[PDB]
Every structure is written in structure tokens, then in C-alpha cells.
Amino acid sequence: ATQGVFTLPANTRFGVTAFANSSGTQTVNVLVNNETAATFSGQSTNNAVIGTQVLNSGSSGKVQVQVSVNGRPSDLVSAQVILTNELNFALVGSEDGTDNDYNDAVVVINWPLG
Amino acid sequence: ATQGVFTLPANTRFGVTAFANSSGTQTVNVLVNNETAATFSGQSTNNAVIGTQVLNSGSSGKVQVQVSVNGRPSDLVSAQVILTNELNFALVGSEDGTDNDYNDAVVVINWPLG
Amino acid sequence: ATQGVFTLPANTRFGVTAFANSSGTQTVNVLVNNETAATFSGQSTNNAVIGTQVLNSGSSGKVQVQVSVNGRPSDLVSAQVILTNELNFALVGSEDGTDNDYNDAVVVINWPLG
Amino acid sequence: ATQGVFTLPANTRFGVTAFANSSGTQTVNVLVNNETAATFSGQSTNNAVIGTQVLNSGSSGKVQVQVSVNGRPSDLVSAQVILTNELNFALVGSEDGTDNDYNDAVVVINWPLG
Amino acid sequence: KKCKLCLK
Numbered sequence: 001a002t003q004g005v006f007t008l009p010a011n012t013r014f015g016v017t018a019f020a021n022s023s024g025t026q027t028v029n030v031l032v033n034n035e036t037a038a039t040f041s042g043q044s045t046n047n048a049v050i051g052t053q054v055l056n057s058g059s060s061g062k063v064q065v066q067v068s069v070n071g072r073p074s075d076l077v078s079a080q081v082i083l084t085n086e087l088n089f090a091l092v093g094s095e096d097g098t099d100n101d102y103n104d105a106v107v108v109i110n111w112p113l114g
Numbered sequence: 115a116t117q118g119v120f121t122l123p124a125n126t127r128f129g130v131t132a133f134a135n136s137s138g139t140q141t142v143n144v145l146v147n148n149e150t151a152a153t154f155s156g157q158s159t160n161n162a163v164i165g166t167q168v169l170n171s172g173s174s175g176k177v178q179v180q181v182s183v184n185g186r187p188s189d190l191v192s193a194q195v196i197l198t199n200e201l202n203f204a205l206v207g208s209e210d211g212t213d214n215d216y217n218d219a220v221v222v223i224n225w226p227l228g
Numbered sequence: 229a230t231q232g233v234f235t236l237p238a239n240t241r242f243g244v245t246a247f248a249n250s251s252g253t254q255t256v257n258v259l260v261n262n263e264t265a266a267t268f269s270g271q272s273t274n275n276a277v278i279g280t281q282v283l284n285s286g287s288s289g290k291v292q293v294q295v296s297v298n299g300r301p302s303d304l305v306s307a308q309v310i311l312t313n314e315l316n317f318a319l320v321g322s323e324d325g326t327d328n329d330y331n332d333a334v335v336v337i338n339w340p341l342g
Numbered sequence: 343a344t345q346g347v348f349t350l351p352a353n354t355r356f357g358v359t360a361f362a363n364s365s366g367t368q369t370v371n372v373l374v375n376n377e378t379a380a381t382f383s384g385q386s387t388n389n390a391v392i393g394t395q396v397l398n399s400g401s402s403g404k405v406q407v408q409v410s411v412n413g414r415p416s417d418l419v420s421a422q423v424i425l426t427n428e429l430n431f432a433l434v435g436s437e438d439g440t441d442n443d444y445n446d447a448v449v450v451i452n453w454p455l456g
Numbered sequence: 457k458k459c460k461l462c463l464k
């Protein structure tokens with residue numbers, strides 16, 4: 001199934017934060033309305049934040065996360081969770097190799113803000 | 115029900131990251147085996163990462179998040195989600211006031227690392 | 229925080245199904261638009277289905293689950309999970325005593341149908 | 343990434359329940375320790391509970407869900423959620439055609455029981 | 457099935 005695509009309420013601010021756990025340099029693209037809105041890159045094996053950004057979900061509300069290592073897209077897992085019918089998490093794991101810990105880039109999208 | 119308490123595998127490294135979305139100064143304490151292992155404080159209405167850290171779950175694996183504003187405990191909501199049977203998130207939201215957006219301090223715990 | 233309350237898309241059919249794991253007879257009420265739309269009661273310590281029904285979320289989309297055991301309100305836990313940005317689960321556990329297993333009545337709501 | 347595979351606590355009773363939402367007759371197989379332990383089938387576009395059963399996770403705790411329609415395997419999506427650090431749901435959706443609603447067979451595993 | 461009626 002398609003992974004890493006989330007429909008947020010339209011015109012709503014959200015946070016997106018990426019962590020790295022890989023010897024490969026991670027590249028995270030965040031698309032809004034099918035257009036690149038933010039790009040992160042960094043390398044860590046210790047969960048370092050390689051980027052964190054406030055964005056707007058735009059007219060469609062469609063947010064997509066892509067993850068790449070040295071030009072090669074990683075395999076993605078994702079889900080959305082909602083607590084007390086109000087607090088929203090869209091979660092992405094990614095795998096760049098063969099060990100399948102799926103933590104190589106970890107991306108957390110949260111809303112509402114403020 | 116009790117919220118903000120998670121049983122992790124013993125002796126496992128994990129990331130803990132806190133965001134702030136409130137006019138009140140958030141205090142986030144992360145306890146491991148009932149001892150404070152990390153504290154973050156900060157004020158933001160724009161999802162600032164007021165702290166991130168790598169901790170070890172230790173012999174008991176018990177991890178607890180506490181959130182307080184000027185000494186008063188916030189009301190907590192939480193859950194744990196596991197992707198592809200491997201990638202773990204423990205999620206915490208909190209409310210310090212009356213609007214029930216439950217984003218005033220948001221805490222995300224992830225494992226495995228590396 | 230409020231538990232057992234979910235905002236569904238308006239005018240959408242959803243399934244609701246309840247399981248029982250307690251020596252007490254469970255009473256499960258499902259409210260749509262703040263009116264009771266379905267009632268399940270049954271007793272099992274072996275996860276028996278005590279009720280399953282298809283409902284419509286109505287104009288408001290507000291769906292609320294309440295659990296009772298002989299007039300005593302059960303404490304609730306709940307969350308909503310969305311897979312591949314399409315498949316929705318609204319999950320409710322409940323506790324009628326002090327052993328804190330929260331499985332005494334388990335309620336699963338899922339949509340879309342068809 | 344692999345989907346529909348869950349590591350449960352060893353030697354623990356769990357419920358497994360399947361719902362159908364397709365013109366195609368669903369077949370749900372449940373494997374424990376790589377051996378078929380339950381099989382459900384039915385045909386409904388209205389969320390029929392085509393099967394429900396209590397199984398034991400056995401010494402390995404490995405539980406796998408597989409879905410097919412008239413011989414062809416369905417694409418699966420899955421995740422596990424834990425409420426108040428005690429109540430577990432392993433969730434599965436599946437797609438047998440091209441409309442990508444991933445509800446054609448829905449499978450919920452829950453534990454603990456009793 | 458020449459008539460597009462292979463049905464589920």
C-alpha cells in the first residue's frame with residue numbers, strides 16, 4: 001500500500017521533525033500539494049534531529065514524506081494516530097538497507113499547533 | 115486510566131523529544147525506574163523542540179513522562195504504536211488549561227535506535 | 229481527558245462490534261449525534277462478541293461509546309488509528325474493576341464499509 | 343515492509359476477528375509459529391463478522407495474518423497499538439482489487455483476554 | 457465470459 005501520505009485538515013499548521021539512525025546520510029522531503037515544501041538532510045546513528053519545521057497543509061491538506069539515501073528511496077512504513085479525538089500524529093519509519101529496523105530516518109508530523 | 119507510563123524492553127536506548135504549544139512554560143520530566151533522567155523546560159506557541167535526548171530504559175524498562183506548568187501537573191493522554199512489528203513510538207499529549215487541544219507539551223519516544 | 233468520543237466523516241456507515249472479558253455483564257451504548265443508536269449487553273470471560281451493528285455517523289459525525297456494568301460506569305481508554313490514509317479504527321477499552329486490564333468490554337469501530 | 347506479522351507475548355491467549363467488505367469472498371488464514379491455526383471466510387459488503395476465535399500464541403508468540411480472494415493474495419497493511427500500557431490491538435486491512443479502500447477483509451487481534 | 461459476466 002501507499003505509505004507516507006497523510007490527509008490533514010486544509011490550511012492547518014503542522015510540525016514535521018526528522019531523526020536519523022543510519023550510517024547513511026538521510027534526505028527527507030516533505031511535499032505539500034504535491035510540491036516540495038521542506039527538505040532535511042543529515043547523518044547520525046544516535047537519533048539526532050536532522051530537521052524540524054513548521055509548515056502549512058495548504059488547500060488540499062495532502063502531506064507526503066519521502067526518504068532517500070544517496071539517491072536511493074528508502075522503504076517506508078507509516079500510520080496516523082489520534083488521541084482524545086484532538087491530538088494528531090502522522091508517523092513514518094524508513095529502511096535504507098537490509099537489517100529492517102526501519103529507524104534509518106524517523107519522521108514525526110504533529111498537529112494542531114499553538 | 116494511567117497515562118504517560120510505558121514498558122520498554124529492558125536495557126534499550128530510546129529517543130525522547132518534547133514540543134511546546136502554549137503560552138505557559140512547559141516542564142517535561144522523563145523518569146526511568148522512577149528516577150528523573152531528563153528534564154526540558156521551555157515556552158513556545160510554534161512547536162519548539164524544547165528538548166531531545168537519548169536515554170537507556172534500564173533494568174526495569176519502565177519509562178514515565180510528566181508535564182507541569184508553574185508546578186501544576188498537566189492532564190496527560192498517551193498511547194504506543196508499532197510499525198512493521200519493529201519500529202516503536204510512545205506518544206504523550208498534555209493539557210495545561212481549558213481549551214483541550216492537548217498539544218501544550220507533546221512528547222514522542224522512539225526505539226530502537228542506531 | 230475525554231475518552232470514547234470520535235469524529236467520523238459525516239453521513240458515513242461504520243461498523244461497531246463489542247467483545248467481553250469480565251465476569252460482569254457488560255452494557256455498551258453507542259451514541260450518534262448525542263442520541264443512543266445501539267445497545268449491546270452480554271457476559272463473557274472468553275472474548276465473546278456481545279454485539280455487532282452497522283450505523284450511520286449522521287450529520288455531525290459524532291460517535292460516542294459508553295460502557296456500564298450494572299449501573300457502574302466503566303473507565304475508558306481510546307484512540308483512533310488510520311492505515312494507508314484510508315482505513316480507520318476507533319478503539320475502546322474499558323475497566324469495570326481494579327485489576328486494570330481494560331479489556332472488560334472491548335469496542336472496535338471501523339470505517340469505511342462496503 | 344512486511345505487514346500482518348505480530349510478536350505477541352509467549353503462551354498468551356488472544357482473540358482474532360475478521361470482517362468482510364467486498365463483493366469477493368474473503369479467506370483469512372491465521373498462522374501461529376508458522377502453522378495455520380484458524381481460517382475464516384465469507385462474503386459481505388456490510389462488515390459481516392465472518393469469523394472470531396480465541397487462539398494461544400504458543401511458545402514463539404509469532405502470529406501472522408494472510409488474506410486471499412479466490413486464490414490470489416491480498417495486499418496488507420497493519421500496525422499494533424497499546425492503550426494505557428496494557429491493552430493491545432493488532433490491526434490488519436487488505437485490498438483485493440483497485441479501489442484501495444483496504445477494508446476488503448479487516449482483522450483485529452486483541453489481548454490480553456479474561 | 458465472452459459477455460463480461462465473470463462475477464464475484
Ligand SMILES: *C(=O)C[C@@H]1O[C@@H](C)[C@@H](O)[C@@H](O)[C@@H]1O
Nearest residue numbers: 342363364365366438439441
Ligand atoms: C470487486 O468488485 C471489488 C471489491 O468489491 C467492491 C464491492 C468494493 O468493496 C471493493 O472495495 C472491493 O475491492
Ligand SMILES: [Ca+2]
Nearest residue numbers: 100101102104
Ligand atoms: Ca536499517
Ligand SMILES: [Ca+2]
Nearest residue numbers: 021022104228
Ligand atoms: Ca538503523
Ligand SMILES: [Ca+2]
Nearest residue numbers: 210215216218
Ligand atoms: Ca491547551
Ligand SMILES: [Ca+2]
Nearest residue numbers: 114135136218
Ligand atoms: Ca496549546
Ligand SMILES: [Ca+2]
Nearest residue numbers: 328329330332
Ligand atoms: Ca478489569
Ligand SMILES: [Ca+2]
Nearest residue numbers: 249250332456
Ligand atoms: Ca477483564
Ligand SMILES: [Ca+2]
Nearest residue numbers: 438443444446
Ligand atoms: Ca477494495
Ligand SMILES: [Ca+2]
Nearest residue numbers: 342363364446
Ligand atoms: Ca471494499
